[PDB]
Amino acid sequence: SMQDTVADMLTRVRNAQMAKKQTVSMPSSKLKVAIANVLQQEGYISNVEVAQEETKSTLTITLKYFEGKPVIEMVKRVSRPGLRQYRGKDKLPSVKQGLGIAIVSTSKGIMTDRAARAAGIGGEVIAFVS
Amino acid sequence: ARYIGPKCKLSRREGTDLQLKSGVKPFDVKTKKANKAPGQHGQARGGKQSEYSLQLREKQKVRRIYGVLERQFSNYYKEAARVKGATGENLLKLLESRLDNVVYRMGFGSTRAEARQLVSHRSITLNGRRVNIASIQVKAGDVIAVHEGAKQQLRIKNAIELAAQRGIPAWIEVDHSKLEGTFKAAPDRSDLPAEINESLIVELYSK
Amino acid sequence: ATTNQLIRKGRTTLVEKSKVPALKACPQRRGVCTRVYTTTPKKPNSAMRKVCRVRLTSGFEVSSYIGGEGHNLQEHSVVLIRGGRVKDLPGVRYHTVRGSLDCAGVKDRNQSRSKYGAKRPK
Amino acid sequence: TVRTLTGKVVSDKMDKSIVVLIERRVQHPLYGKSIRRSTKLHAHDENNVAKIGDVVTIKESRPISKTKAWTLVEVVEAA
Amino acid sequence: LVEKLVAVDRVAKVVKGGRIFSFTALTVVGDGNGRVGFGRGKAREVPAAISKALEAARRNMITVDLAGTTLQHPVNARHGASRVYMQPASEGTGVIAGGAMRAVLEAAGVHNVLAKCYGSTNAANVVNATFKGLRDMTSPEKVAAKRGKSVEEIQ
Amino acid sequence: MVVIRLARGGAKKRPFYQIVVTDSRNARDGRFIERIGFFNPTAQGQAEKLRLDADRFAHWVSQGAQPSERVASLAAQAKKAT
RNA sequence: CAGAAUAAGCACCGGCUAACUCUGUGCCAGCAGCCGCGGUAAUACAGAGGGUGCGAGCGUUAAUCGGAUUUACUGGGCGUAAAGCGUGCGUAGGCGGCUUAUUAAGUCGGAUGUGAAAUCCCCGAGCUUAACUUGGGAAUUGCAUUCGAUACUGGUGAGCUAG
RNA sequence: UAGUUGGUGGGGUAAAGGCCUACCAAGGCGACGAUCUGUAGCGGGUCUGAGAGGAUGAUCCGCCACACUGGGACUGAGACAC
Ligand SMILES: NCCC[C@H](N)CC(=O)NCCC[C@H](N)CC(=O)NCCC[C@H](N)CC(=O)N[C@@H]1[C@H](O)[C@@H](OC(N)=O)[C@@H](CO)O[C@H]1NC1=N[C@@H]2C(=O)NC[C@@H](O)[C@H]2N1
């Protein structure tokens, strides 16, 4: 059964980018929307939309392609249900010598590792994007 | 221990003048066998070598001129690596700071071996006291003089006359009339010859 | 392996067996020569190579090669043995030190004298 | 100012004594995964108020018997 | 244009009444300022194989965007069963790498780098892996351009 | 009893003493309660010869610690110097 | 004060690996860490000459870690190279859909106490230099108490329907 | 596992305590490894390693244990005492 919806979302985005799709859709959740907002702010994706039919909620993401290649080149799930990963403020990972982002869930909300270091807090390392 | 024996074959093997003789007669007239290795199977300079051969041959050339053995040279490299800066220039500065080499560059000895013998036989005073260790590190603003009994030595007079032909370094201010001098600063890399390559030595010691 | 499998049962390290069991973690051993003889090499080598069966102070009986040309050993000699294989001889895992206790140094030898235990010529 | 623990009672058969199970969650030193560990502490309960299944608090004290060195403070929740 | 000869091997082909022997050569050419390429050559004799390998190397070249004299970021690359890891280093470190990586890095103009091979160390495969890693390495300007941001925003 | 005494260290023929407060039954260079200074009878040049923490010395004397003869002489000399 | 007077050996030279020839012997004598040398021109055995590396030392044996991503947490695999149980059901356990309130166990942050000295590292000091001795720092990545944060995981209450 | 696990009265100790004793109850530990068995003094540290790890516990410092092999107590502030 499905036991990691965040990993499902990341895999959907990865496969859509590899297949050169324009948009990608999934069932929605607040955590997924929070991650997508960080991606949009950092500029890896273009637009985030949430639609509601009744109790169902759908998340739609518009993908970006610059030159020939997709903008999101690498996206890796770091923390997983079988192995949770927590880091302090001094040991937050850096992706590609600061050229990528690490998505971190902290007590002040989801941010990048750069913002987490600026705020001087740690948290759970969700994913690496580059 | 210090190497004792023939210096000309040592210079020939590395393929350059190692400044191991006084210099009254040039290297070519002194040896007549340059471009030939000392062995009967000795060949020309154009013989190809491996990278391990080149690195080793550079380190041996660096050691032979200063008269330093392997243990002390390895300790020199280990200190230079620890000190912050360029490792090669640090090693060159350490080699150029030895008391015997400073005495030789002050012109009190025709060769570095003569300078070493002068230092060892207590003929040299550093900052007013008689020392006998050739490996003493000279620091900035130091004073090296010739001892009273050491003065009036024809070897010393010939040494200073021969040194007059060479150019006195910039970091050494020497009064030949009083047989005294002051080491002012460690030589920079530009002052030293550029034929010495130290990247090979650093690679060899850092493998 | 999964993380849970690693937690339940970790990784296993296999011990390495010594290639010189009779020395018993000692640089050398003393023994009594039980039988001195000659053997033939395994192919593709052919010779008559000198070996001795020795009983060690560790409680083991082994075979040890005699290096060099010309030896004065025999039964009941007391010898010192070190480690070292002979390769083409099956089952010879040790060497006999020349010129140590009863074994003598090789004769008329002037290079590599520290091996084979020959003193300086006059 | 006195060390205290919260747990659940797993035995009340003994006279004036209870066995409370304390649970903690730690990281595995090598593999990093969060695991759970359990310890059983005998505690002193003067009036036998505690029963099997309640959630209780116990504080450290001087020894009362061979195995009991903790004493009941209160019953947080009842079965 | 610096040219390095990484490897030379003698190969055999069986025919009736004997074997035909040949030579293969692998070469890496570069300009020392971010342009490098590699090639292979086969011939009955060594010099012709070397010349053909050099010609192929000059035909197959790429441009690499260095950060000074070192890499922009850590690189993981692989070709077949050969995997390579490369890491930027501070000035004075040197090229701490195996010979096959070293030729490519020096021809490309890298002066300080720490590198490692995992798996097979076959020369051609290692050269391919290092070549791919250098080709795929990115830079802050390209990252900012692709994300629609500024390099100061990227940091 | 509690004593204030000298524990020896340094090299052969060149002793260097730490001034320590300790139980008298302990070994000379072993377990101690607190170190409050040092003494170097062969100091040359810029080397310091005697440093004593007078506050800790007085505090420990007020609680019954007994200085040795050498330590008492050193304390008197340090007080005279300062 | 006297007078060069009292003071150099060891290993190696086929490739890995810096350093090559001549005699002697002829699958013998022998060498060998691995691949391998020796069966009449042996740069690989023994001697000699020459050279190379070290130097009051030089080699051999033994032992630990490394190279070994060759037990792979960092950091490996299972169609044919070693490796998916013959196939199901199911116990302990591991993991687990969406929304909301609350808690604060995991998680994160601050403060305080502690983490002996010596040792390691840094700047100095004294030894003719160095080893060595020594002043002061830094570090001791930990532990405990207490005060905070609530995104995620866990607990509790309520609700939902895509499993 | 049957003084075993807990309780009460009493004894005992410098002092808490099945430490001992008489009764009362049937408890206590264990797959988070009890019981049995092999090996081993522990730490600060030392060697190696990029690190994570691996190996180690001479000389210096702290703690523990032992004194030909076992069982005891006396004196004393302190010993079950090289
Ligand atoms: N293989 C023989 C196939 C025969 C087979 N029977 C065919 C068959 O049955 N059905 C047809 C099915 C065809 C299939 N759908 C298409 C396909 O195979 N896609 C994948 C292959 C892509 C492409 N085709 C090959 C390619 O780009 N190579 C380059 C090339 O060698 C060289 O670069 C240049 N430019 O020269 C090198 C750098 O020097 O980088 C290589 N790149 C890479 N090396 C890496 C590596 O190994 N792993 C990981 C990743 O890093 C790899 N990328």
PDB file of C-alpha atoms (C1' of nucleotides) in Angstrom, chain G residues 17-141:
ATOM      1  C1'   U G  17      59.835   0.073  -8.182  1.00  0.00           C
ATOM      2  C1'   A G  18      65.211   4.519  -8.434  1.00  0.00           C
ATOM      3  C1'   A G  19      69.416   1.873 -10.093  1.00  0.00           C
ATOM      4  C1'   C G  20      73.258  -2.885 -15.837  1.00  0.00           C
ATOM      5  C1'   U G  21      77.045  -5.231 -17.641  1.00  0.00           C
ATOM      6  C1'   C G  22      80.916  -9.272 -17.612  1.00  0.00           C
ATOM      7  C1'   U G  23      82.437 -13.929 -15.965  1.00  0.00           C
ATOM      8  C1'   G G  24      80.961 -19.091 -13.512  1.00  0.00           C
ATOM      9  C1'   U G  25      76.949 -22.782 -13.863  1.00  0.00           C
ATOM     10  C1'   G G  26      73.420 -25.235 -17.420  1.00  0.00           C
ATOM     11  C1'   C G  27      65.369 -27.194 -15.063  1.00  0.00           C
ATOM     12  C1'   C G  28      71.838 -28.420 -11.738  1.00  0.00           C
ATOM     13  C1'   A G  29      73.298 -25.342  -8.024  1.00  0.00           C
ATOM     14  C1'   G G  30      69.877 -21.921  -6.669  1.00  0.00           C
ATOM     15  C1'   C G  31      66.141 -17.289  -6.444  1.00  0.00           C
ATOM     16  C1'   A G  32      61.160 -16.014  -5.338  1.00  0.00           C
ATOM     17  C1'   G G  33      55.922 -10.687  -1.754  1.00  0.00           C
ATOM     18  C1'   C G  34      52.797 -11.601  -6.728  1.00  0.00           C
ATOM     19  C1'   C G  35      53.392 -12.522 -11.908  1.00  0.00           C
ATOM     20  C1'   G G  36      57.663 -15.817 -12.483  1.00  0.00           C
ATOM     21  C1'   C G  37      63.364 -16.930 -13.526  1.00  0.00           C
ATOM     22  C1'   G G  38      67.420 -21.462 -14.391  1.00  0.00           C
ATOM     23  C1'   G G  39      66.929 -26.862 -19.841  1.00  0.00           C
ATOM     24  C1'   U G  40      74.924 -22.696 -23.441  1.00  0.00           C
ATOM     25  C1'   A G  41      75.495 -15.981 -24.944  1.00  0.00           C
ATOM     26  C1'   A G  42      70.681 -15.766 -17.613  1.00  0.00           C
ATOM     27  C1'   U G  43      70.283  -7.346 -17.008  1.00  0.00           C
ATOM     28  C1'   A G  44      66.097 -12.455 -12.215  1.00  0.00           C
ATOM     29  C1'   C G  45      71.137 -18.043  -9.500  1.00  0.00           C
ATOM     30  C1'   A G  46      77.027 -16.997  -7.273  1.00  0.00           C
ATOM     31  C1'   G G  47      81.206 -13.658  -7.771  1.00  0.00           C
ATOM     32  C1'   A G  48      83.248  -8.969  -9.713  1.00  0.00           C
ATOM     33  C1'   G G  49      82.936  -3.890 -11.599  1.00  0.00           C
ATOM     34  C1'   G G  50      79.565   0.025 -11.751  1.00  0.00           C
ATOM     35  C1'   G G  51      75.348   2.292  -9.810  1.00  0.00           C
ATOM     36  C1'   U G  52      70.912   3.378  -6.659  1.00  0.00           C
ATOM     37  C1'   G G  53      68.478   4.075  -1.563  1.00  0.00           C
ATOM     38  C1'   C G  54      69.522   4.847   3.327  1.00  0.00           C
ATOM     39  C1'   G G  55      73.240   6.013   6.994  1.00  0.00           C
ATOM     40  C1'   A G  56      75.169   4.507  13.190  1.00  0.00           C
ATOM     41  C1'   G G  57      72.418   2.199  11.168  1.00  0.00           C
ATOM     42  C1'   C G  58      70.495  -1.233   7.305  1.00  0.00           C
ATOM     43  C1'   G G  59      67.458  -5.595   6.259  1.00  0.00           C
ATOM     44  C1'   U G  60      64.131 -10.008   7.670  1.00  0.00           C
ATOM     45  C1'   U G  61      60.223 -12.113  10.619  1.00  0.00           C
ATOM     46  C1'   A G  62      55.757 -11.140  13.697  1.00  0.00           C
ATOM     47  C1'   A G  63      51.415  -7.962  14.795  1.00  0.00           C
ATOM     48  C1'   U G  64      47.205  -3.701  14.016  1.00  0.00           C
ATOM     49  C1'   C G  65      44.604  -0.384  10.847  1.00  0.00           C
ATOM     50  C1'   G G  66      44.600   1.211   5.672  1.00  0.00           C
ATOM     51  C1'   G G  67      44.358   0.515   0.700  1.00  0.00           C
ATOM     52  C1'   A G  68      39.227  -3.396   0.879  1.00  0.00           C
ATOM     53  C1'   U G  69      32.613   0.230  -1.520  1.00  0.00           C
ATOM     54  C1'   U G  70      36.059  -7.131   0.278  1.00  0.00           C
ATOM     55  C1'   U G  71      29.601  -6.847   5.996  1.00  0.00           C
ATOM     56  C1'   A G  72      28.547  -1.189   2.051  1.00  0.00           C
ATOM     57  C1'   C G  73      25.274   3.735   8.643  1.00  0.00           C
ATOM     58  C1'   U G  74      28.176   7.243   5.735  1.00  0.00           C
ATOM     59  C1'   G G  75      28.779   3.317   1.335  1.00  0.00           C
ATOM     60  C1'   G G  76      27.204  -2.992  -2.086  1.00  0.00           C
ATOM     61  C1'   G G  77      24.132  -6.650  -4.112  1.00  0.00           C
ATOM     62  C1'   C G  78      20.182 -11.213  -5.487  1.00  0.00           C
ATOM     63  C1'   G G  79      17.058 -12.949 -14.488  1.00  0.00           C
ATOM     64  C1'   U G  80      22.156 -15.483 -16.595  1.00  0.00           C
ATOM     65  C1'   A G  81      28.434 -13.976 -12.263  1.00  0.00           C
ATOM     66  C1'   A G  82      27.259 -16.030  -4.978  1.00  0.00           C
ATOM     67  C1'   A G  83      22.321 -14.764  -3.651  1.00  0.00           C
ATOM     68  C1'   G G  84      13.987 -14.510  -3.849  1.00  0.00           C
ATOM     69  C1'   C G  85      12.106 -19.520   1.004  1.00  0.00           C
ATOM     70  C1'   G G  86       7.905 -24.469  -3.516  1.00  0.00           C
ATOM     71  C1'   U G  87       3.357 -21.591  -2.365  1.00  0.00           C
ATOM     72  C1'   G G  88      -0.261 -19.348   0.936  1.00  0.00           C
ATOM     73  C1'   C G  89      -2.351 -17.821   5.822  1.00  0.00           C
ATOM     74  C1'   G G  90      -1.128 -15.599  10.000  1.00  0.00           C
ATOM     75  C1'   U G  91       1.480 -14.244  15.777  1.00  0.00           C
ATOM     76  C1'   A G  92       5.192 -10.726  17.909  1.00  0.00           C
ATOM     77  C1'   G G  93       7.173  -6.651  15.483  1.00  0.00           C
ATOM     78  C1'   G G  94       8.083  -2.657  11.508  1.00  0.00           C
ATOM     79  C1'   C G  95       5.305   0.819   8.644  1.00  0.00           C
ATOM     80  C1'   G G  96       0.657   3.158   7.474  1.00  0.00           C
ATOM     81  C1'   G G  97      -5.031   7.580   3.953  1.00  0.00           C
ATOM     82  C1'   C G  98      -7.431  12.993   4.541  1.00  0.00           C
ATOM     83  C1'   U G  99      -9.315  17.300   8.008  1.00  0.00           C
ATOM     84  C1'   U G 100      -9.396  19.502  12.788  1.00  0.00           C
ATOM     85  C1'   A G 101      -8.567  20.650  18.305  1.00  0.00           C
ATOM     86  C1'   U G 102      -5.228  19.483  22.093  1.00  0.00           C
ATOM     87  C1'   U G 103      -0.675  17.419  24.355  1.00  0.00           C
ATOM     88  C1'   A G 104       4.467  18.055  24.116  1.00  0.00           C
ATOM     89  C1'   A G 105       7.049  11.889  24.230  1.00  0.00           C
ATOM     90  C1'   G G 106      10.313  11.977  19.649  1.00  0.00           C
ATOM     91  C1'   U G 107      12.363  16.617  17.159  1.00  0.00           C
ATOM     92  C1'   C G 108      14.535  21.886  17.579  1.00  0.00           C
ATOM     93  C1'   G G 109      16.322  26.323  20.512  1.00  0.00           C
ATOM     94  C1'   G G 110      18.219  29.097  25.105  1.00  0.00           C
ATOM     95  C1'   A G 111      20.237  29.152  30.061  1.00  0.00           C
ATOM     96  C1'   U G 112      22.677  26.731  34.207  1.00  0.00           C
ATOM     97  C1'   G G 113      25.718  22.761  36.362  1.00  0.00           C
ATOM     98  C1'   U G 114      29.021  19.172  35.095  1.00  0.00           C
ATOM     99  C1'   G G 115      32.347  16.890  31.515  1.00  0.00           C
ATOM    100  C1'   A G 116      39.643  15.731  37.092  1.00  0.00           C
ATOM    101  C1'   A G 117      44.790  16.405  35.773  1.00  0.00           C
ATOM    102  C1'   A G 118      47.859  14.629  32.120  1.00  0.00           C
ATOM    103  C1'   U G 119      47.348  13.526  26.565  1.00  0.00           C
ATOM    104  C1'   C G 120      45.810  15.785  21.152  1.00  0.00           C
ATOM    105  C1'   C G 121      45.739  21.119  18.660  1.00  0.00           C
ATOM    106  C1'   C G 122      47.138  26.767  18.858  1.00  0.00           C
ATOM    107  C1'   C G 123      50.069  31.051  20.546  1.00  0.00           C
ATOM    108  C1'   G G 124      54.191  31.807  23.711  1.00  0.00           C
ATOM    109  C1'   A G 125      58.434  30.590  27.353  1.00  0.00           C
ATOM    110  C1'   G G 126      63.342  27.608  28.760  1.00  0.00           C
ATOM    111  C1'   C G 127      66.710  24.079  27.253  1.00  0.00           C
ATOM    112  C1'   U G 128      73.627  26.292  22.306  1.00  0.00           C
ATOM    113  C1'   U G 129      69.189  23.597  18.171  1.00  0.00           C
ATOM    114  C1'   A G 130      65.903  19.665  18.367  1.00  0.00           C
ATOM    115  C1'   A G 131      63.790  15.932  21.188  1.00  0.00           C
ATOM    116  C1'   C G 132      62.007  17.350  25.869  1.00  0.00           C
ATOM    117  C1'   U G 133      59.887  20.529  29.874  1.00  0.00           C
ATOM    118  C1'   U G 134      56.348  24.217  30.716  1.00  0.00           C
ATOM    119  C1'   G G 135      52.302  29.086  30.991  1.00  0.00           C
ATOM    120  C1'   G G 136      47.653  30.209  29.039  1.00  0.00           C
ATOM    121  C1'   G G 137      43.957  28.999  25.761  1.00  0.00           C
ATOM    122  C1'   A G 138      41.055  25.999  22.497  1.00  0.00           C
ATOM    123  C1'   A G 139      38.796  21.396  22.677  1.00  0.00           C
ATOM    124  C1'   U G 140      36.436  17.382  25.569  1.00  0.00           C
ATOM    125  C1'   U G 141      31.446  16.301  19.554  1.00  0.00           C
TER     126        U G 141
END
